[PDB]
mmCIF file of C-alpha atoms in Angstrom:
data_model
loop_
_atom_site.group_PDB
_atom_site.id
_atom_site.type_symbol
_atom_site.label_atom_id
_atom_site.label_comp_id
_atom_site.label_asym_id
_atom_site.label_seq_id
_atom_site.Cartn_x
_atom_site.Cartn_y
_atom_site.Cartn_z
ATOM 1 C CA UNK A 1 -24.341 -8.454 -1.431
ATOM 2 C CA UNK A 2 -27.756 -6.909 -2.186
ATOM 3 C CA UNK A 3 -28.941 -4.301 -4.654
ATOM 4 C CA UNK A 4 -30.757 -1.693 -2.564
ATOM 5 C CA UNK A 5 -29.865 1.903 -3.523
ATOM 6 C CA UNK A 6 -30.814 2.617 0.080
ATOM 7 C CA UNK A 7 -28.064 0.176 1.271
ATOM 8 C CA UNK A 8 -25.681 1.411 -1.455
ATOM 9 C CA UNK A 9 -26.206 4.964 -0.167
ATOM 10 C CA UNK A 10 -25.427 3.900 3.429
ATOM 11 C CA UNK A 11 -22.229 2.155 2.255
ATOM 12 C CA UNK A 12 -21.063 5.208 0.283
ATOM 13 C CA UNK A 13 -21.699 7.442 3.318
ATOM 14 C CA UNK A 14 -20.020 4.950 5.645
ATOM 15 C CA UNK A 15 -16.921 4.928 3.406
ATOM 16 C CA UNK A 16 -16.632 8.705 3.655
ATOM 17 C CA UNK A 17 -17.242 8.612 7.442
ATOM 18 C CA UNK A 18 -14.947 5.611 7.969
ATOM 19 C CA UNK A 19 -12.265 7.494 5.999
ATOM 20 C CA UNK A 20 -12.865 10.725 8.022
ATOM 21 C CA UNK A 21 -13.337 9.651 11.684
ATOM 22 C CA UNK A 22 -11.685 6.208 11.587
ATOM 23 C CA UNK A 23 -13.687 2.965 11.594
ATOM 24 C CA UNK A 24 -13.293 2.280 15.342
ATOM 25 C CA UNK A 25 -14.405 5.789 16.328
ATOM 26 C CA UNK A 26 -17.419 6.081 14.004
ATOM 27 C CA UNK A 27 -20.823 4.665 14.892
ATOM 28 C CA UNK A 28 -23.726 3.880 12.586
ATOM 29 C CA UNK A 29 -25.429 6.876 14.319
ATOM 30 C CA UNK A 30 -22.819 9.184 12.847
ATOM 31 C CA UNK A 31 -23.580 7.536 9.456
ATOM 32 C CA UNK A 32 -27.418 7.605 9.474
ATOM 33 C CA UNK A 33 -27.205 11.151 10.817
ATOM 34 C CA UNK A 34 -24.821 12.236 8.083
ATOM 35 C CA UNK A 35 -27.492 10.954 5.647
ATOM 36 C CA UNK A 36 -30.159 12.994 7.506
ATOM 37 C CA UNK A 37 -31.869 9.877 8.827
ATOM 38 C CA UNK A 38 -32.906 8.470 12.198
ATOM 39 C CA UNK A 39 -30.154 6.211 13.684
ATOM 40 C CA UNK A 40 -32.446 3.180 13.314
ATOM 41 C CA UNK A 41 -32.760 3.851 9.565
ATOM 42 C CA UNK A 42 -29.547 1.864 8.947
ATOM 43 C CA UNK A 43 -30.544 -1.075 11.185
ATOM 44 C CA UNK A 44 -32.856 -2.656 8.531
ATOM 45 C CA UNK A 45 -29.895 -2.867 6.155
ATOM 46 C CA UNK A 46 -27.012 -3.312 8.573
ATOM 47 C CA UNK A 47 -27.730 -4.610 12.072
ATOM 48 C CA UNK A 48 -24.099 -4.076 13.160
ATOM 49 C CA UNK A 49 -21.186 -1.811 12.231
ATOM 50 C CA UNK A 50 -19.215 -4.930 11.286
ATOM 51 C CA UNK A 51 -21.941 -6.073 8.902
ATOM 52 C CA UNK A 52 -21.624 -2.734 7.120
ATOM 53 C CA UNK A 53 -17.826 -2.952 6.917
ATOM 54 C CA UNK A 54 -18.158 -6.506 5.549
ATOM 55 C CA UNK A 55 -20.616 -5.283 2.910
ATOM 56 C CA UNK A 56 -18.164 -2.515 1.900
ATOM 57 C CA UNK A 57 -15.204 -4.913 1.812
ATOM 58 C CA UNK A 58 -17.082 -7.642 -0.096
ATOM 59 C CA UNK A 59 -18.389 -5.136 -2.624
ATOM 60 C CA UNK A 60 -14.864 -3.749 -3.162
ATOM 61 C CA UNK A 61 -13.126 -7.138 -3.314
ATOM 62 C CA UNK A 62 -15.706 -8.637 -5.701
ATOM 63 C CA UNK A 63 -15.680 -5.517 -7.843
ATOM 64 C CA UNK A 64 -11.902 -5.496 -8.468
ATOM 65 C CA UNK A 65 -12.019 -9.291 -9.078
ATOM 66 C CA UNK A 66 -14.916 -8.811 -11.547
ATOM 67 C CA UNK A 67 -12.927 -5.982 -13.189
ATOM 68 C CA UNK A 68 -9.734 -7.897 -13.956
ATOM 69 C CA UNK A 69 -11.638 -11.086 -14.771
ATOM 70 C CA UNK A 70 -13.669 -9.206 -17.411
ATOM 71 C CA UNK A 71 -10.317 -7.742 -18.533
ATOM 72 C CA UNK A 72 -8.777 -11.204 -19.106
ATOM 73 C CA UNK A 73 -9.238 -12.912 -22.487
ATOM 74 C CA UNK A 74 -7.852 -16.428 -22.616
ATOM 75 C CA UNK A 75 -8.084 -16.317 -26.420
ATOM 76 C CA UNK A 76 -5.299 -13.702 -26.787
ATOM 77 C CA UNK A 77 -1.537 -13.818 -26.229
ATOM 78 C CA UNK A 78 -0.363 -13.776 -22.602
ATOM 79 C CA UNK A 79 1.464 -10.404 -22.842
ATOM 80 C CA UNK A 80 -1.779 -8.725 -24.067
ATOM 81 C CA UNK A 81 -3.706 -10.458 -21.253
ATOM 82 C CA UNK A 82 -1.199 -9.017 -18.773
ATOM 83 C CA UNK A 83 -1.416 -5.508 -20.232
ATOM 84 C CA UNK A 84 -5.210 -5.701 -20.020
ATOM 85 C CA UNK A 85 -5.619 -7.041 -16.516
ATOM 86 C CA UNK A 86 -2.850 -4.790 -15.082
ATOM 87 C CA UNK A 87 -4.518 -1.761 -16.744
ATOM 88 C CA UNK A 88 -7.951 -2.702 -15.259
ATOM 89 C CA UNK A 89 -6.415 -3.561 -11.909
ATOM 90 C CA UNK A 90 -4.457 -0.292 -11.500
ATOM 91 C CA UNK A 91 -7.341 1.855 -12.892
ATOM 92 C CA UNK A 92 -9.777 0.204 -10.459
ATOM 93 C CA UNK A 93 -7.494 0.944 -7.559
ATOM 94 C CA UNK A 94 -7.109 4.638 -8.517
ATOM 95 C CA UNK A 95 -10.873 5.210 -9.179
ATOM 96 C CA UNK A 96 -12.098 3.223 -6.150
ATOM 97 C CA UNK A 97 -9.335 4.156 -3.713
ATOM 98 C CA UNK A 98 -11.625 5.360 -0.873
ATOM 99 C CA UNK A 99 -13.670 2.203 -0.908
ATOM 100 C CA UNK A 100 -10.432 0.208 -1.416
ATOM 101 C CA UNK A 101 -8.807 1.720 1.684
ATOM 102 C CA UNK A 102 -11.810 0.947 3.929
ATOM 103 C CA UNK A 103 -11.998 -2.589 2.529
ATOM 104 C CA UNK A 104 -8.261 -3.232 2.933
ATOM 105 C CA UNK A 105 -7.225 -1.455 6.141
ATOM 106 C CA UNK A 106 -9.991 -2.627 8.485
ATOM 107 C CA UNK A 107 -9.786 -6.420 7.804
ATOM 108 C CA UNK A 108 -8.806 -6.930 11.436
ATOM 109 C CA UNK A 109 -12.340 -5.791 12.300
ATOM 110 C CA UNK A 110 -14.126 -8.486 10.266
ATOM 111 C CA UNK A 111 -15.813 -11.456 11.939
ATOM 112 C CA UNK A 112 -14.131 -14.865 11.344
ATOM 113 C CA UNK A 113 -16.669 -15.967 8.695
ATOM 114 C CA UNK A 114 -16.412 -12.611 6.942
ATOM 115 C CA UNK A 115 -12.613 -12.602 7.085
ATOM 116 C CA UNK A 116 -12.441 -16.092 5.492
ATOM 117 C CA UNK A 117 -14.697 -14.979 2.611
ATOM 118 C CA UNK A 118 -12.682 -11.837 1.879
ATOM 119 C CA UNK A 119 -9.343 -13.695 2.030
ATOM 120 C CA UNK A 120 -10.736 -16.188 -0.456
ATOM 121 C CA UNK A 121 -11.645 -13.362 -2.885
ATOM 122 C CA UNK A 122 -8.141 -11.910 -2.431
ATOM 123 C CA UNK A 123 -6.592 -15.289 -3.259
ATOM 124 C CA UNK A 124 -8.727 -15.425 -6.455
ATOM 125 C CA UNK A 125 -7.611 -11.925 -7.446
ATOM 126 C CA UNK A 126 -3.946 -12.932 -7.280
ATOM 127 C CA UNK A 127 -4.654 -16.178 -9.167
ATOM 128 C CA UNK A 128 -5.893 -14.150 -12.205
ATOM 129 C CA UNK A 129 -2.386 -12.823 -12.553
ATOM 130 C CA UNK A 130 -0.618 -16.117 -11.799
ATOM 131 C CA UNK A 131 -2.681 -17.872 -14.515
ATOM 132 C CA UNK A 132 -1.680 -15.214 -17.087
ATOM 133 C CA UNK A 133 1.973 -15.386 -16.037
ATOM 134 C CA UNK A 134 1.844 -19.190 -16.247
ATOM 135 C CA UNK A 135 0.181 -19.011 -19.659
ATOM 136 C CA UNK A 136 3.048 -16.837 -20.981
ATOM 137 C CA UNK A 137 5.687 -19.100 -19.516
ATOM 138 C CA UNK A 138 4.041 -22.075 -21.276
ATOM 139 C CA UNK A 139 4.122 -20.141 -24.570
ATOM 140 C CA UNK A 140 7.742 -18.938 -24.162
ATOM 141 C CA UNK A 141 6.492 -15.322 -23.990
ATOM 142 C CA UNK A 142 7.516 -14.896 -20.341
ATOM 143 C CA UNK A 143 10.624 -15.907 -18.381
ATOM 144 C CA UNK A 144 9.702 -15.149 -14.752
ATOM 145 C CA UNK A 145 12.193 -15.677 -11.976
ATOM 146 C CA UNK A 146 9.360 -16.659 -9.710
ATOM 147 C CA UNK A 147 5.721 -16.734 -10.749
ATOM 148 C CA UNK A 148 4.250 -16.245 -7.254
ATOM 149 C CA UNK A 149 6.700 -13.359 -6.536
ATOM 150 C CA UNK A 150 5.662 -11.697 -9.822
ATOM 151 C CA UNK A 151 1.922 -12.044 -9.095
ATOM 152 C CA UNK A 152 2.467 -10.719 -5.519
ATOM 153 C CA UNK A 153 4.440 -7.735 -6.776
ATOM 154 C CA UNK A 154 1.745 -6.832 -9.309
ATOM 155 C CA UNK A 155 -1.113 -7.221 -6.835
ATOM 156 C CA UNK A 156 0.927 -5.263 -4.289
ATOM 157 C CA UNK A 157 1.487 -2.324 -6.737
ATOM 158 C CA UNK A 158 -2.230 -2.044 -7.631
ATOM 159 C CA UNK A 159 -3.333 -2.164 -3.991
ATOM 160 C CA UNK A 160 -0.787 0.483 -2.958
ATOM 161 C CA UNK A 161 -2.078 2.857 -5.642
ATOM 162 C CA UNK A 162 -5.151 3.209 -3.398
ATOM 163 C CA UNK A 163 -2.870 4.622 -0.680
ATOM 164 C CA UNK A 164 -0.828 7.244 -2.572
ATOM 165 C CA UNK A 165 -2.983 8.184 -5.545
ATOM 166 C CA UNK A 166 -3.339 10.900 -6.790
ATOM 167 C CA UNK A 167 0.202 12.351 -6.729
ATOM 168 C CA UNK A 168 1.562 15.416 -8.527
ATOM 169 C CA UNK A 169 2.994 13.135 -11.211
ATOM 170 C CA UNK A 170 0.156 10.690 -11.332
ATOM 171 C CA UNK A 171 -3.343 12.069 -11.127
ATOM 172 C CA UNK A 172 -4.604 10.361 -14.301
ATOM 173 C CA UNK A 173 -5.314 6.583 -13.797
ATOM 174 C CA UNK A 174 -4.511 5.907 -17.468
ATOM 175 C CA UNK A 175 -0.932 7.223 -17.114
ATOM 176 C CA UNK A 176 -0.116 5.229 -13.982
ATOM 177 C CA UNK A 177 -1.599 2.038 -15.446
ATOM 178 C CA UNK A 178 0.467 2.485 -18.616
ATOM 179 C CA UNK A 179 3.646 2.879 -16.559
ATOM 180 C CA UNK A 180 2.812 -0.169 -14.452
ATOM 181 C CA UNK A 181 1.983 -2.201 -17.530
ATOM 182 C CA UNK A 182 5.533 -1.557 -18.867
ATOM 183 C CA UNK A 183 7.022 -2.612 -15.531
ATOM 184 C CA UNK A 184 4.881 -5.774 -15.199
ATOM 185 C CA UNK A 185 5.959 -6.962 -18.657
ATOM 186 C CA UNK A 186 9.577 -6.292 -17.694
ATOM 187 C CA UNK A 187 9.130 -8.096 -14.378
ATOM 188 C CA UNK A 188 7.922 -11.294 -16.058
ATOM 189 C CA UNK A 189 10.776 -11.001 -18.573
ATOM 190 C CA UNK A 190 8.624 -10.330 -21.647
ATOM 191 C CA UNK A 191 10.249 -8.629 -24.687
ATOM 192 C CA UNK A 192 9.612 -4.847 -25.032
ATOM 193 C CA UNK B 1 15.581 13.792 22.844
ATOM 194 C CA UNK B 2 13.058 13.256 25.669
ATOM 195 C CA UNK B 3 12.459 9.905 27.322
ATOM 196 C CA UNK B 4 8.801 10.730 28.018
ATOM 197 C CA UNK B 5 8.171 11.850 24.413
ATOM 198 C CA UNK B 6 9.977 8.764 23.042
ATOM 199 C CA UNK B 7 7.754 6.466 25.139
ATOM 200 C CA UNK B 8 4.640 8.285 23.973
ATOM 201 C CA UNK B 9 5.707 7.749 20.356
ATOM 202 C CA UNK B 10 6.421 4.033 20.937
ATOM 203 C CA UNK B 11 3.092 3.446 22.684
ATOM 204 C CA UNK B 12 1.207 5.501 20.047
ATOM 205 C CA UNK B 13 2.741 3.411 17.221
ATOM 206 C CA UNK B 14 1.274 0.273 18.750
ATOM 207 C CA UNK B 15 -2.188 1.690 19.551
ATOM 208 C CA UNK B 16 -2.378 3.485 16.186
ATOM 209 C CA UNK B 17 -1.363 0.279 14.378
ATOM 210 C CA UNK B 18 -3.849 -1.791 16.473
ATOM 211 C CA UNK B 19 -6.968 0.462 16.714
ATOM 212 C CA UNK B 20 -6.313 2.717 13.712
ATOM 213 C CA UNK B 21 -5.202 6.321 14.075
ATOM 214 C CA UNK B 22 -8.651 8.002 13.875
ATOM 215 C CA UNK B 23 -10.027 5.578 16.468
ATOM 216 C CA UNK B 24 -7.504 6.412 19.217
ATOM 217 C CA UNK B 25 -7.238 9.458 21.482
ATOM 218 C CA UNK B 26 -4.150 10.818 23.197
ATOM 219 C CA UNK B 27 -6.035 10.036 26.429
ATOM 220 C CA UNK B 28 -5.929 6.312 25.603
ATOM 221 C CA UNK B 29 -2.228 6.614 24.711
ATOM 222 C CA UNK B 30 -1.648 8.292 28.131
ATOM 223 C CA UNK B 31 -3.795 5.525 29.663
ATOM 224 C CA UNK B 32 -1.728 2.814 27.965
ATOM 225 C CA UNK B 33 1.459 4.175 29.604
ATOM 226 C CA UNK B 34 -0.410 4.864 32.855
ATOM 227 C CA UNK B 35 0.834 8.456 32.562
ATOM 228 C CA UNK B 36 -1.283 11.016 34.447
ATOM 229 C CA UNK B 37 -3.780 13.223 32.595
ATOM 230 C CA UNK B 38 -2.094 16.024 30.611
ATOM 231 C CA UNK B 39 1.355 14.364 30.493
ATOM 232 C CA UNK B 40 1.120 14.125 26.728
ATOM 233 C CA UNK B 41 0.314 17.789 25.995
ATOM 234 C CA UNK B 42 3.779 19.336 26.740
ATOM 235 C CA UNK B 43 5.240 16.872 24.189
ATOM 236 C CA UNK B 44 2.289 16.599 21.752
ATOM 237 C CA UNK B 45 -0.362 19.313 21.817
ATOM 238 C CA UNK B 46 -2.511 17.449 19.271
ATOM 239 C CA UNK B 47 -2.934 13.869 18.136
ATOM 240 C CA UNK B 48 -1.843 15.093 14.637
ATOM 241 C CA UNK B 49 1.520 16.365 15.988
ATOM 242 C CA UNK B 50 2.196 12.892 17.419
ATOM 243 C CA UNK B 51 1.284 11.296 14.064
ATOM 244 C CA UNK B 52 3.635 13.794 12.461
ATOM 245 C CA UNK B 53 6.540 13.027 14.808
ATOM 246 C CA UNK B 54 6.001 9.271 14.241
ATOM 247 C CA UNK B 55 5.897 9.630 10.423
ATOM 248 C CA UNK B 56 8.971 11.926 10.505
ATOM 249 C CA UNK B 57 10.981 9.479 12.588
ATOM 250 C CA UNK B 58 10.001 6.496 10.415
ATOM 251 C CA UNK B 59 10.742 8.344 7.169
ATOM 252 C CA UNK B 60 14.173 9.588 8.359
ATOM 253 C CA UNK B 61 14.995 6.060 9.494
ATOM 254 C CA UNK B 62 14.222 4.309 6.182
ATOM 255 C CA UNK B 63 16.080 7.027 4.252
ATOM 256 C CA UNK B 64 19.102 6.637 6.607
ATOM 257 C CA UNK B 65 18.868 2.864 6.085
ATOM 258 C CA UNK B 66 18.932 2.905 2.269
ATOM 259 C CA UNK B 67 21.460 5.742 2.198
ATOM 260 C CA UNK B 68 23.808 3.704 4.386
ATOM 261 C CA UNK B 69 23.204 0.871 1.858
ATOM 262 C CA UNK B 70 24.140 2.925 -1.189
ATOM 263 C CA UNK B 71 27.736 3.137 -2.458
ATOM 264 C CA UNK B 72 28.037 5.805 -5.190
ATOM 265 C CA UNK B 73 31.439 4.580 -6.373
ATOM 266 C CA UNK B 74 30.419 0.951 -7.072
ATOM 267 C CA UNK B 75 28.522 -0.451 -10.104
ATOM 268 C CA UNK B 76 24.858 0.542 -10.354
ATOM 269 C CA UNK B 77 23.299 -2.972 -10.355
ATOM 270 C CA UNK B 78 25.124 -3.687 -7.081
ATOM 271 C CA UNK B 79 23.884 -0.394 -5.587
ATOM 272 C CA UNK B 80 20.326 -1.362 -6.623
ATOM 273 C CA UNK B 81 20.711 -4.742 -4.995
ATOM 274 C CA UNK B 82 22.098 -3.351 -1.767
ATOM 275 C CA UNK B 83 19.534 -0.522 -1.519
ATOM 276 C CA UNK B 84 16.461 -2.605 -2.389
ATOM 277 C CA UNK B 85 17.529 -5.259 0.134
ATOM 278 C CA UNK B 86 17.895 -2.599 2.857
ATOM 279 C CA UNK B 87 14.608 -0.995 1.813
ATOM 280 C CA UNK B 88 12.635 -4.257 1.936
ATOM 281 C CA UNK B 89 14.224 -5.456 5.181
ATOM 282 C CA UNK B 90 13.591 -2.130 6.983
ATOM 283 C CA UNK B 91 9.890 -2.393 6.043
ATOM 284 C CA UNK B 92 9.588 -5.973 7.246
ATOM 285 C CA UNK B 93 11.560 -5.070 10.430
ATOM 286 C CA UNK B 94 9.616 -1.840 11.211
ATOM 287 C CA UNK B 95 6.151 -2.616 9.985
ATOM 288 C CA UNK B 96 4.009 -1.129 12.819
ATOM 289 C CA UNK B 97 5.896 2.160 12.574
ATOM 290 C CA UNK B 98 5.816 2.093 8.751
ATOM 291 C CA UNK B 99 2.082 1.326 8.682
ATOM 292 C CA UNK B 100 1.347 4.297 10.941
ATOM 293 C CA UNK B 101 3.821 6.638 9.205
ATOM 294 C CA UNK B 102 2.666 5.693 5.710
ATOM 295 C CA UNK B 103 -1.064 4.820 5.809
ATOM 296 C CA UNK B 104 -2.378 7.939 7.549
ATOM 297 C CA UNK B 105 -0.677 10.696 5.544
ATOM 298 C CA UNK B 106 -4.099 12.183 4.772
ATOM 299 C CA UNK B 107 -4.431 12.876 8.513
ATOM 300 C CA UNK B 108 -1.359 15.162 8.456
ATOM 301 C CA UNK B 109 -1.601 18.957 8.163
ATOM 302 C CA UNK B 110 -0.456 20.509 4.822
ATOM 303 C CA UNK B 111 2.760 21.752 6.424
ATOM 304 C CA UNK B 112 3.466 18.336 7.864
ATOM 305 C CA UNK B 113 2.407 16.443 4.772
ATOM 306 C CA UNK B 114 4.829 18.452 2.571
ATOM 307 C CA UNK B 115 7.674 18.003 5.056
ATOM 308 C CA UNK B 116 7.092 14.221 4.906
ATOM 309 C CA UNK B 117 6.812 14.354 1.075
ATOM 310 C CA UNK B 118 10.214 16.095 0.986
ATOM 311 C CA UNK B 119 11.647 13.004 2.765
ATOM 312 C CA UNK B 120 9.825 10.522 0.506
ATOM 313 C CA UNK B 121 11.127 12.380 -2.569
ATOM 314 C CA UNK B 122 14.652 12.076 -1.079
ATOM 315 C CA UNK B 123 13.930 8.398 -0.516
ATOM 316 C CA UNK B 124 12.799 7.878 -4.111
ATOM 317 C CA UNK B 125 15.835 9.918 -5.289
ATOM 318 C CA UNK B 126 18.211 7.257 -3.892
ATOM 319 C CA UNK B 127 16.634 4.828 -6.358
ATOM 320 C CA UNK B 128 16.293 7.229 -9.256
ATOM 321 C CA UNK B 129 19.890 8.456 -8.798
ATOM 322 C CA UNK B 130 20.977 4.763 -8.934
ATOM 323 C CA UNK B 131 18.807 3.916 -11.956
ATOM 324 C CA UNK B 132 20.165 7.068 -13.668
ATOM 325 C CA UNK B 133 23.791 6.030 -12.990
ATOM 326 C CA UNK B 134 22.971 2.548 -14.340
ATOM 327 C CA UNK B 135 21.341 3.807 -17.527
ATOM 328 C CA UNK B 136 24.123 6.382 -18.138
ATOM 329 C CA UNK B 137 26.706 3.597 -17.687
ATOM 330 C CA UNK B 138 24.841 1.056 -19.924
ATOM 331 C CA UNK B 139 23.799 -1.436 -17.185
ATOM 332 C CA UNK B 140 20.106 -0.527 -17.285
ATOM 333 C CA UNK B 141 17.690 0.284 -20.056
ATOM 334 C CA UNK B 142 14.715 1.785 -18.193
ATOM 335 C CA UNK B 143 11.455 2.809 -19.915
ATOM 336 C CA UNK B 144 10.748 5.477 -17.295
ATOM 337 C CA UNK B 145 13.081 6.200 -14.410
ATOM 338 C CA UNK B 146 10.558 7.975 -12.158
ATOM 339 C CA UNK B 147 8.013 5.201 -12.758
ATOM 340 C CA UNK B 148 10.488 2.434 -11.800
ATOM 341 C CA UNK B 149 11.688 4.263 -8.635
ATOM 342 C CA UNK B 150 8.066 4.843 -7.655
ATOM 343 C CA UNK B 151 7.239 1.162 -8.151
ATOM 344 C CA UNK B 152 10.277 0.099 -6.099
ATOM 345 C CA UNK B 153 9.363 2.499 -3.272
ATOM 346 C CA UNK B 154 5.747 1.377 -3.354
ATOM 347 C CA UNK B 155 6.662 -2.325 -3.245
ATOM 348 C CA UNK B 156 8.806 -1.779 -0.179
ATOM 349 C CA UNK B 157 6.193 0.276 1.640
ATOM 350 C CA UNK B 158 3.501 -2.307 0.903
ATOM 351 C CA UNK B 159 5.575 -5.023 2.605
ATOM 352 C CA UNK B 160 4.619 -3.371 5.914
ATOM 353 C CA UNK B 161 0.960 -4.084 5.101
ATOM 354 C CA UNK B 162 1.171 -7.814 4.187
ATOM 355 C CA UNK B 163 4.335 -9.230 5.841
ATOM 356 C CA UNK B 164 4.514 -12.009 7.033
ATOM 357 C CA UNK B 165 2.281 -13.919 4.627
ATOM 358 C CA UNK B 166 1.844 -17.575 3.812
ATOM 359 C CA UNK B 167 4.281 -17.106 0.977
ATOM 360 C CA UNK B 168 6.956 -14.917 2.675
ATOM 361 C CA UNK B 169 7.848 -14.845 6.362
ATOM 362 C CA UNK B 170 11.624 -14.317 6.068
ATOM 363 C CA UNK B 171 12.608 -10.719 5.201
ATOM 364 C CA UNK B 172 15.743 -11.929 3.369
ATOM 365 C CA UNK B 173 13.694 -14.092 0.971
ATOM 366 C CA UNK B 174 11.225 -11.368 -0.020
ATOM 367 C CA UNK B 175 14.184 -8.991 -0.333
ATOM 368 C CA UNK B 176 15.956 -11.423 -2.680
ATOM 369 C CA UNK B 177 12.739 -11.794 -4.756
ATOM 370 C CA UNK B 178 12.211 -8.046 -4.935
ATOM 371 C CA UNK B 179 15.826 -7.422 -5.950
ATOM 372 C CA UNK B 180 15.241 -9.756 -8.915
ATOM 373 C CA UNK B 181 12.071 -7.866 -9.877
ATOM 374 C CA UNK B 182 13.686 -4.419 -9.563
ATOM 375 C CA UNK B 183 16.656 -5.453 -11.741
ATOM 376 C CA UNK B 184 14.197 -6.763 -14.377
ATOM 377 C CA UNK B 185 12.111 -3.599 -14.095
ATOM 378 C CA UNK B 186 15.018 -1.370 -15.155
ATOM 379 C CA UNK B 187 16.213 -3.633 -17.981
ATOM 380 C CA UNK B 188 19.095 -5.526 -16.432
ATOM 381 C CA UNK B 189 20.199 -8.813 -18.093
ATOM 382 C CA UNK B 190 19.473 -12.043 -16.085
#
């Protein structure tokens, strides 16, 4: 993706602006201006709006993938793996909700090459959960009705956190993750 | 009940879903119906009021749907099955409207937001009231009733984002799968 704090700063500002004015209505000029720069100050980093959205979406998709992957430990029991990855997944989605929304909701705006790369990262994200669920089935820890349905439901819950969070009940990521951990274990038919 | 207002809502749903809410003006929505300039204003004085009327309609509709699918005098697992099925199917069947009514709540005014949240709470209540009846009758052994009802509601809403996918393109199949998950969630046997 790159490493420039200058680019990172443009992406952060674009997220805020994309969230405020809508992606289709905002221009890079809004963004560079909001950062007190000349409109051409973004061009070195992002030649097009779409390039900037792709950077945001890639960053976000890779980050949540990196998060749950680092949270998975194939040397521990499957239920513990599921607690850990669900915790990291839900927490990520609460903490990075603004970036997550921009990444998720504007996929229709990505070029074909960029869309195919993002979809591939999304497939990998789900597969982290399916592997864990499979592992537990193999060990007799889990008794899923349907492994793919279970992985979908879990990925779906984490992603939707970025929409509704924070609520009056759930404003602490740790509390929502704990609740969703209990439900995920129940979903895959693990003992309590 | 105005024909002109109803058409504005329908057209806005599609433009809002296609271009994103922030990215569209009421001018473009008037343009899309080839209505003359200013035809929108007597019905919707702001873009936000149109968003509000769309969200309000969609929220009343899904609540009506799951309410009609609940039967307070029958066993709780059956109520859960009937209501989740209706909830999932509505979301698959009304996805454009759901997407608009659910994914832009931060664009609503405080007054409007809280009105909508009153309806969502009523929506979640249908599920919590059923999980409560199930626990208090011995069918269910939930860890946390609010948490389970939240997760059910969130699963259904999220259908409007992803459906149809490679894995599910028939609303009845994803409904069936989500009924299984919801029953498991609340501690039902099987």
